[PDB]
Design a protein around this ligand. Structure first.
Ligand code: MG
Lengths: 113, 300, 57, 113, 207, 49
DNA sequence: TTTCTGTCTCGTGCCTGGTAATCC
RNA sequence: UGCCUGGUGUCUUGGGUGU
DNA sequence: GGATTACACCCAAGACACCAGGCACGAGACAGAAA
């Protein structure tokens, strides 16, 4: 699908650590994936992500949500979680952090959910 | 014989594969093919193979020497004496065989080494035996004025360099052709350089690193055939200026030698290469001498 | 390429063999193209493996 | 501590010169690059050292020796701490104070925080 | 001294391509690089910049009726066998037929006369290495099931011996990972092993 | 050179009004001289200045 | 006035150093 | 067969946004 | 006397070794001078 079509991927990482960029590859269809390689796929549904608002006064200001991809350019929250974040929709902004490992994903889904 | 290292390392592409299973090779024929024996010895020194020398009639010699040594008695005492003599003789043969094998091996090694030494001597002599190019209407041994044109590789962005040297062996003028070699401008500029400046080179040398130089050679030959660039003869079928390829081992080594850099501190590497080609045409012997130690690395 | 070791001065060496990827091409026994840096294993012999450093002929 | 902190090591007799990674240069425009503050301070220290060495071997008026050695002491001190209360700070040609190594480590924008 | 030596076609070829005439001739296999694909021919380039071409009769197998472009594309290097060499013009013709690219194995002309060559030793080593190639590795199978037990035939029978008639045990089969042996107690000191063939297996250890 | 596209520039290095532009496109083309290297060895005028 | 030229002025170039609380 | 590019100042200051 | 005084984010705008003076290489013009 490539790096412009959702769902897609951005890079393919070999065992030795070399990165294959899928934007500048003319033979993307001529790539066979071996076990143990890594594919830097796009963010998809039900991916745990850490979500945060400043100032972080207490530990409920950082909680892990499940991703749902939607149109338009704003983060969207169920309104019950606007209390722990001390957030309202008059212009506030919030930070999203993506875990990059299986261990970190498990920690987010089992501790900060 | 083959060791386990020999059993595994002698591949169908390796040079040692020629004798992986040789047997009963005559010694007398080895001297005519020294490289085979040298390569066998080299493989042996690598711990791969084992060279064995054996005689088909060894039993004949053993029996003859026993018959000379053995007694003619028939009594059981004489039988015991003959048995003791034969056993001691067999032990003596066992001790003696390796020394004789080593002596024969060393003799054949020396013979093959001397043969290959003479062969290399003849090859080098043939390599370095060539008088300078003789221009027409001149006696042999006359040093000709030469012009060298080269561009090296021919990739997009490869200008053609020209270096002219007179019979004196001193550089007279170097020129750059910055247009495409297939354009009319290149041919016109080369013709102007050849004719107007009174350069009048006796022979033109062309060389390069790849097949792209062939197209330049063809283009130059066509230009010479078209413009009738005959050699100037000092005072009448005027002869054309010859265009040939030039061997360039000495030129390649000269373009990297610091001797050229000291001689020409403000010149490009391709200019040094062209100068080396021109000097080789003028005098191959002196160029081969200029290699000093790197001459030993030439493919002789 | 023969498998031997030599010692030579830097001057004696001709030049580096600059080869483009269009020139430095390797094909395995099965015919699949193998490029620079890939890991292959010897089919027979010691059956060793390693990363390709340079390809020539 | 005899092994690690010997009292006479508190007096500097040889100065370690940090690698350029610690004091990287910046290209102000497309042509002229700018030397770092630490590089200029080290140049000043080295000039003072050269001056002391030259003065010592040639001729020794004690007043001149005191002046030049006090200048060297000032440069070395301000190279590591430019907020010494009770004396003027070292200034750049632009008039701004020199960013000593101590200033690199303190504050919200320092190394630690 | 002899007059200046003029290079000939072989010498010019060796000088330019840095490839000897012996190492580049008829009956040799080289990994050429495809540079242009056409219906009636394919233009390819060798390692030494020698441009080559193959007529349509040889890019594809004589039995196949596909198109040259569909099977081979630009940038897809393939093995080729040299048919003809134009040394003067640095042009060569190649063949992709497997009768050349594959059957040509003992390309050396080493004299294999039995008087001076030990053919028997080389043959024996050849079956030795071929048997080494035939040699492979195998491992055990692990299955998660309440009535599955990793036991031998006699082991399963002894395990069922302490159990009453009708109890069932499951063990791996000797016919392969796609087969399963089920042992059940027919009678006191009487057991039946039944082989079960597995189809549509997700994995060797899977059911 | 920048990774954008220079194809929207005119002869004088300036884009013309009415042209649709996207991110990272080059709207002003400017070059600064650099002392040439030894590329004059065998480059056919195709050396970076 | 014709012709060879001198020799010092001068353009182009460059080195390198002078120059606001509070609190303990 | 003519063949394709990732590399981005620093230091101050000022005005703003959300608590 | 010393040390420290919430968190995060955005944008724009103005400054960043200059210089001058003494030492060298090359050149050239307008005037000397023989004929
Ligand atoms: Mg708000």
């Amino acid at each position: 699908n490539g790096p412009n079509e959702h769902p897609g991927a951005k890079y393919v990482i070999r065992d030795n650590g070399d990165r294959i960029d899928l934007r500048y590859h003319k033979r993307a269809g001529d790539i066979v994936l071996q076990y143990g390689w890594k594919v830097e796929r796009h963010l998809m549904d039900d991916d745990p992500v850490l979500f945060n608002r400043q100032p972080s006064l207490h530990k409920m200001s950082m909680m892990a949500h499940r991703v749902k991809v939607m149109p338009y350019s704003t983060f969207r929250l169920n309104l019950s979680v606007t209390s722990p974040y001390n957030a309202d929709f008059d212009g506030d902004e919030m930070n999203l952090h993506v875990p990059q490992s299986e261990e970190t994903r498990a920690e987010l889904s089992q501790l900060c959910a | 014989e083959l060791t386990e290292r020999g059993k595994l390392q002698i591949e169908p592409e390796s040079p040692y594969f020629d004798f992986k299973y040789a047997k009963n090779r005559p010694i007398s024929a080895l001297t005519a093919t020294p490289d085979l024996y040298l390569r066998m010895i080299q493989a042996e020194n690598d711990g791969l193979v084992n060279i064995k020398v054996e005689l088909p009639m060894l039993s004949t010699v053993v029996d003859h020497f026993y018959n000379i040594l053995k007694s003619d008695g028939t009594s059981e005492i004489s039988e015991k004496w003959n048995a003791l003599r034969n056993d001691a003789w067999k032990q003596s043969l066992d001790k003696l065989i390796p020394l004789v094998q080593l002596n024969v091996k060393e003799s054949i090694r020396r013979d093959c080494e001397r043969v290959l030494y003479f062969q290399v001597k003849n090859s080098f002599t043939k390599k370095i035996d060539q008088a300078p190019y003789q221009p027409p209407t001149y006696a042999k041994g006359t040093i000709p004025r030469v012009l060298t044109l080269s561009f090296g590789e021919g990739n997009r962005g490869d200008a053609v360099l020209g270096v002219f040297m007179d019979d004196s062996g001193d550089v007279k003028s170097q020129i750059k052709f910055d247009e495409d070699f297939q354009s009319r401008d290149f041919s016109d500029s080369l013709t102007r350089y050849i004719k107007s400046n009174n350069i009048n080179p006796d022979i033109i040398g062309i060389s390069g690193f790849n097949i792209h130089t062939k197209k330049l050679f063809d283009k130059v030959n066509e230009l010479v055939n078209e413009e009738r660039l005959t050699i100037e003869y000092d005072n009448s079928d005027k002869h054309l200026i010859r265009v040939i390829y030039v061997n360039d081992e000495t030129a390649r080594l000269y373009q990297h030698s610091s001797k050229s850099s000291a001689e020409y501190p403000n010149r490009p590497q391709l200019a040094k290469y062209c100068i080396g080609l021109a000097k080789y045409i003028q005098s191959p012997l002196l160029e081969y001498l200029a290699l000093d130690e790197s001459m030993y690395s030439l493919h002789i | 390429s023969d498998g031997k070791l030599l010692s030579l001065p830097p001057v004696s060496i001709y030049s580096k063999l600059n080869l483009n990827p269009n020139q430095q091409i390797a094909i395995d026994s099965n015919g699949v193209e193998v490029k620079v840096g890939d890991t292959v294993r010897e089919f027979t012999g010691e059956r060793r493996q390693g990363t390709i450093l340079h390809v020539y002929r | 501590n005899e092994d690690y902190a010997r009292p006479e090591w508190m007096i500097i007799t040889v100065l370690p010169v940090p690698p350029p990674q610690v004091r990287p240069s910046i290209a102000m425009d497309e042509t002229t690059q700018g030397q770092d503050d630490l590089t200029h301070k080290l140049s000043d220290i080295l000039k003072a050292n050269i001056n002391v060495q030259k003065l010592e071997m040639d001729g020794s008026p004690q007043h001149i020796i005191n002046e030049v050695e006090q200048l060297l002491q000032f440069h070395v001190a301000t190279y590591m701490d430019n907020d010494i209360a009770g004396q003027p700070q070292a200034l750049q040609k632009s008039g701004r104070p020199v960013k000593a190594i101590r200033a690199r480590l303190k504050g919200k924008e320092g190394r630690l925080r | 001294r002899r007059d200046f030596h003029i290079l000939n076609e072989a010498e010019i070829f060796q000088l330019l391509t840095r490839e000897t005439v012996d190492s580049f001739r008829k009956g040799m296999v080289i990994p050429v690089y495809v540079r242009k694909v056409e219906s009636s021919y394919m233009s390819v380039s060798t390692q030494s910049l020698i441009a080559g071409n193959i007529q349509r009769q040889d890019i594809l197998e004589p039995n196949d009726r596909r198109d040259p472009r569909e099977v081979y594309s630009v940038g897809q290097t393939v093995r080729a066998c040299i048919l003809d060499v134009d040394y003067y013009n640095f042009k060569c013709q190649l063949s992709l037929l497997r009768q050349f690219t594959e059957n040509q194995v003992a390309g050396l002309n080493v004299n294999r006369n039995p008087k001076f060559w030990d053919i028997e030793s080389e043959n024996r080593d050849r079956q030795e290495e071929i048997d080494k190639q035939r040699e492979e590795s195998r491992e055990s199978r692990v299955i998660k099931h309440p009535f599955f037990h990793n036991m031998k035939s006699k082991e399963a029978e002894d395990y069922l011996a302490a159990r009453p008639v009708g109890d069932v045990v499951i063990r791996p089969s000797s016919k392969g990972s796609n087969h399963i042996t089920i042992s059940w107690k027919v009678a006191p000191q009487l057991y039946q092993h039944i082989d079960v063939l597995e189809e549509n297996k997700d994995d060797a250890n899977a059911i | 050179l920048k990774h954008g596209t220079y194809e929207k520039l005119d002869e004088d290095g300036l884009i013309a009004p009415g042209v649709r532009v996207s991110g990272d496109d080059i709207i002003i083309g400017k070059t600064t001289p650099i002392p040439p290297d030894t590329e004059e060895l065998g480059q056919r005028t195709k050396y970076h200045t």
